[PDB]
Symmetry: D2
Subunit: 481 residues, 4 copies
């Protein structure tokens, strides 16, 4: 039945890996008390981490169930679907794993984020952008849902399962998701899921309608005028023909700021899930808050006085990371320390460029650069070396690697110092350039600058202080010719 060792081999290893009946049950995890403001009221909330399927999103269940139902083995060569992201990724994976179909065309709104659009391309989707409403009605003849079902109707090699209109959508959660939650949480008193196509909620609600009729079925929609990835609003849901009205006992409306806030909290607790997951949990919070404000929370409780709630976590937060910062204030994140270093010191450092004093002077076709101030150079320097001073490097200035502002000034002055004319004015091109400063640190920054400009540059570890220590017998010129 199920894979005990979670080990999949043979020609069908990937098929069985994605199989919800063969792979272990999708994890169900109770959220911590610190995140559950109804813990003292006896509420225990459990998160169904659909993001932990190998596909990383809840829409793998409709995609699996639809494709096995609708694919015709000899003739089905192309799959087309309108989607907000998750379904077409799941269709792309299942079409290859189960059906050998690599031509998957994704129809998406032109107002889907750039990271999400790049993720579609990443998974090998062929995407076409559509103007107008990002969430059109399946009968809006100007929208991508209509165009998709009409392109597969004129060509039998083209297949359009219809996640907005194909019953195999919600039946996938009667088949898999529902029974899993029931076995994992036999004391379940409330099931909660947000509604986009509504397939997830109606599937769960149709299953629990007869598997445990005492279970309360709570769907979540996006507040009017708001937008969150995954669900749609109550208005955008009315034209859909799935039996969602028979699968829910109450509807909550949730905004995007709460959704992204709770998703961020869940991820920091260890339950890594995306914005719609925090959206769902917030809807559950809002309904529990009504029953407490109405004094009716006792109605959900079982014989032990506890209320076991399960809610769906639909996918991962990674595709939406930038949106968390646009929607949530800076107060939700620690700022970067030494943030200025992101725009500077951009180039690599190789340990082989840093040479011990004896090793560097043995190679010395070759040119030695001294980056100390002009009067320090005249006082004493290695005979044969050129002087090239810097405003930002004294004998007293701190090491650039201990002061981010020093590193910024020194790196920038070094980038401006080593212009093209400068390289030729000192004959650095094509030679082994050895660099020396006071303690070696500014010189090492200079090697990163020069290596990125193609000059074979090395630095002396410890600077001139180490050559005076390690090589005390090498006598030094003290402006004398």
């Amino acid at each position: 039945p199920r894979n005990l060792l979670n080990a999949y081999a043979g020609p069908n290893a990937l098929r069985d890996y994605f199989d919800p009946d063969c792979q272990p049950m999708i994890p169900l995890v109770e959220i911590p008390q610190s995140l559950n403001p109804f813990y003292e009221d006896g509420v225990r909330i459990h998160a169904k981490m659909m993001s932990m399927h190998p596909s990383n999103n809840v829409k793998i269940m409709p995609a699996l169930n639809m494709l096995t139902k609708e694919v015709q083995p000899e003739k089905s060569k192309t799959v087309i679907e309108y989607s907000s992201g998750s379904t077409v990724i799941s269709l792309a994976l299942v079409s290859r794993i189960n059906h050998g179909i690599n031509d998957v065309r994704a129809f998406l709104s032109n107002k889907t984020s750039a990271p999400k659009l790049r993720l579609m391309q990443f998974f090998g989707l062929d995407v076409t952008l559509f103007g107008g409403p990002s969430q059109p009605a399946p009968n809006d003849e100007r929208g991508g849902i209509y165009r998709a079902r009409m392109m597969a109707r004129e060509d039998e090699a083209i297949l359009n399962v219809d996640q907005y209109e194909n019953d195999a959508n919600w039946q996938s959660h009667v088949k898999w998701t529902g029974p899993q939650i029931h076995e994992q949480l036999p004391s379940i008193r409330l099931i909660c899921a947000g509604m986009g196509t509504s397939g997830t909620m109606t599937g769960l609600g149709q299953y629990f309608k007869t598997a445990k009729p005492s279970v309360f079925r709570l769907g979540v929609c996006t507040a009017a005028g708001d937008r969150v990835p995954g669900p749609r609003s109550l208005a955008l849901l009315s034209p859909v023909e799935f039996p969602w009205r028979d699968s829910v006992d109450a509807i909550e409306e949730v905004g995007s700021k709460d959704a992204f806030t709770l998703s961020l909290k869940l991820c920091r607790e260890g339950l890594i899930c995306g914005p719609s997951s925090g959206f769902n949990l917030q809807g559950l919070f809002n309904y529990l808050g009504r029953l407490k404000a109405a004094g009716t929370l006792s109605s959900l409780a079982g014989p032990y006085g506890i209320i076991d709630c399960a809610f769906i976590c639909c996918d991962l937060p990674y595709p939406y990371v930038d949106e968390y910062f646009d929607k949530l204030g800076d107060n939700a994140f620690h700022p970067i320390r030494n943030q200025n270093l992101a725009a500077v010191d951009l180039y690599r450092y190789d340990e082989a460029w840093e040479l011990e004093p004896s090793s560097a002077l043995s190679h010395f076709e070759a040119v030695l650069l001294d980056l100390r101030k002009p009067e320090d150079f005249i006082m004493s320097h290695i005979p044969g070396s050129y002087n090239l001073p810097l405003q930002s490097s004294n004998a007293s200035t701190p090491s650039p690697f201990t002061d981010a502002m020093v590193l910024e000034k020194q790196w920038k002055e070094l980038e401006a110092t080593f212009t093209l004319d400068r390289i030729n004015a000192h004959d650095l091109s094509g030679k082994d350039v050895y660099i020396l400063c006071y303690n070696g640190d500014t010189a090492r920054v200079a090697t990163s600058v020069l290596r990125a400009k193609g000059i074979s540059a090395s630095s002396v570890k410890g600077g001139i202080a180490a050559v005076r220590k390690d090589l005390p017998q090498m006598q030094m010129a003290e402006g004398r010719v």
Copy 2:
């Protein structure tokens, strides 16, 4: 022992969820034959999807093992670590789940990508950037590894486990990862893992050194001068003091282009993993290619003539999506169709703004805008309406929702049309503005333009062709006053 139902409840649900002994074994999946160029030679390659731990990366094993070893319950209040990303995310999760520590400070190179830096902030890390080499030696006194261990040495409330120097790193894979692969693949003939801190490889190599001494242990390093997230090069690995030289039988060197290529292929097969995972598989490919070129591949084979290879998949590709496009050519991705629509039609469309002809004219404080050409307006128009023509909208021009170039021209001309002066010149401010065109489509684009500018605008579904059809009794002015 292990959680049969994958259901975690009680105050320790999250602790047990992250527990590798309590949670099902990390999946091991054989890669498809199409991705395995040595399938006919009898090689079967199995991927250990460490990315499928709830933390989504392999470094959860060192983080778990180190923190339980080093945390002192009463005094340990702050955790500090230098990392390339994975470890500090895993330390942030485990420090909160197992030890109640929320003060986690991450020391990172200034040359880590911006998406990765934002991911650190996302998971609640307090990050400080460090110049110089992005992968310093643990004894480089200018690098972040030294600074981390020295800041926890001066303060007992500060804890620095040392992933580069703490043996609990690699022992975590002797404890968990090794035994899991052995039980999942008893016929294992070769174990493969890339080396950054080397903890993963030495742990696996120390375990199999005595669990099944016939197993070949293959480590992978980054080719000289190259860079891939996770591992380091053979040179950057020499100073580390873990017994990695006793845990490997051969070393492969792999470049970044191959690493990102194979990761992309793995993700498109259904094994969603990041660049170091394709890096590892490529190293395995390169060693198998030597033995075939040397005719020695038979040496790895078991009694049935097959060679069972296991390799580590370390994390997910999502934080690196943009890097795949910089490293791989455009030839690896389908381009966006109607790409021009990404920069235009930027605003939302609400179904309630589109009104049937009878419904819109019933509300008609109110102003009706007609967007048809001037001669068409004079020919016949709804009495009481203003005319506002557009260069890009004829009676013959196609619907904007069927031609992306038409949508771009019309939307841009509409954005330029409805300037501030225009809004006041037609008294649109504060009124209910109804918009009419030929077929309704240009008018609907105009409502998205005007709603985003704060004007309460609605369109007539079907345009003037529908008011002539649905309302044939409403007589129309035909430039007559």
Copy 3:
């Protein structure tokens, strides 16, 4: 005693030669400056300006140019004239080379730092300019500056000629020949002669002449104050290497800054003595010397047995090439500001009375031609007035800046700016094509008519054949039954 042209009429094939001749010409005018410009008038000094700017060439250097070329040019060998110059000398050489000697290949060696307006002036007069990058006013023997290299090129070629104003005695001798004797005859009671020093030819000539012709006249040279720069003269330091006997030609030397030079030059112009910065530079030196003797109480000595003291100073050229510098050197005061200055950036295009049509002629042309293919009528009124009554077949393009209350844009500059800007912002290329205005007669009707004429200026600048209905909508009220009926 040569006679001068009493009719100032110059005919014949030598009309231009005689016109430029300081002996045929009337004498260069000498004009006493007014009291309001003479601080020492109450002390008996009379300051007379020698307006060298009034020669046909407009500058003092026509005298050295005439004299040097007459001396140096070889009728059959000379074919090219080359000279280093700051501007005046080489313009004068171009004129004399052609008028008097039939030479047009005149090359001008100039500093690379002379102003961009001045460089164009050299081109304007048909000069051939080569730039030299060293010091602006080099020493004549500096083997880098143009003075030396111009001299050597004239040595290598026997067909080209460098008269060299910097050490040819004919330079300063031309003022012994003309300027000196003229001033002496125009002002016999003269007691002091003043001139700035660039090459020092003008001052050397005046001082050498008056040294013997009237030894009692004081000779006052003017040099540029160190660190400063004035067009024409040189600083004392920059003047020492020239070998003209200028030290023997002056009895004292003043130093003057550029701010004072431009200020006094500007005041002389507003008095009617139109002259450039070096003229105010010379007058300021004279003021400074006269103020030195007045404060020391030695002012009386310069006089004679008469109480008056007659001083003459040189006015070298005209201010027009330097107008820009007066604004940079002097403050925002001493100039009246341009009022309605905002209009300088709007209403940039021409008007034509033919574009403004009587209402009956305009409505006749509109309904003559088929509507929407040959002619359109734009009605700029607010949409709720347009709806009430309008010319059938016309288009409504509302203007926010225009309504039934707005006054004439030509009576308020802010209205003109707002309305011209909105009209310019209204008639984008899409708007022209949205109403298909191209190739059509366009008629404009507004509340005003003045606004509508502004609209015709804007549209015809864009190539649209637009005309306005004179008098506005008020002038066609009698042709609009619906409008007449609404007023019941």
Copy 4:
């Protein structure tokens, strides 16, 4: 018969009044243009230029300005002068208002489209400019243009005065009084008189005078060709509303474009008759009419019993305010290009001979002052030469553009550009602080010495007190033992 100033010397408290008086002044010069400019010289026509630009005011409008103000000004009531103008008239009014009438509050009403150089010129002459946005050359009765509004303001206030050049007969009567009689006396054989028409005062005056004083002279007016624009005149269409009897003053009217006007004005200047665009505009009209009769073979009739035909045309003002337009209107030819033009953008800063020091004086100052606190020595040579031998205590700042082979930057313009650019790019603010040059005496040593002087120009423009070692490293070879020993 009033006498004229035979000395051209004007003294006394009325020196400026007499200086501007056309009756005290010598007559405005009349000068025959040369054959090279007269295509019809072989046919017996002699064309004489009346250089009105030679009045002290430099323009033709001083005659209407003098005559109108003399007529209209009220000694005790008049305190402000207001006039719409294109430029010439209102400058002349400012001068006459002060010289002759002691009035300085002169307001100038100008089109908002007059050039930015011309607007500054109005400010320069102390005028008070108000801009008007309508048509540039409005009709005198257009109640929007400045002509009408200037007239009304003078009506509301009995203390201000608009002489109104556009319909005051004293405008054209001033040329019956002066310009006409002068030309007639300067050229008694005259057969034709030619002038452009703006207000038409000049042509009306000349034509009304010659109509009776010598009825046989042909009167040839010139107007601006439709669609074109010339500074001064008007088009025939724009001229019809003025009520001067100009139609009665002309026997024919030519139309001329602006390109021909500027081309001929430029040629007249290079001949020595310095005059502006309207002057070439008048001459081109005369050429066009004479070419019409020559092609028709009716040229002989204009003559007399003599074979010659003497024509006079007006030259109105000077070209200097319009120099920019000649470049825009005419091609790149007719001007010589500036050679070494690249130098105009480099070597922007001054030089001083005191900065260049004899080698012994430079090395003396350097080792006098303590090194690195009061003085530094920069050695611009290549690092491998600097290592071989250098002045002890000096810093090496290599230049790629300079080495022992490079010639003098003042002998090759490309070397000067490269070296000045690299020196400017070398001495960034960090470089000055990297060697702590601020507040120190700085001495420059190079292979050349010329390069080192360029370096001193660059550094002193940045405030660094830099001097150069004259003669370069070659001049200090005797002071360098190590260098002498290497040459064995």
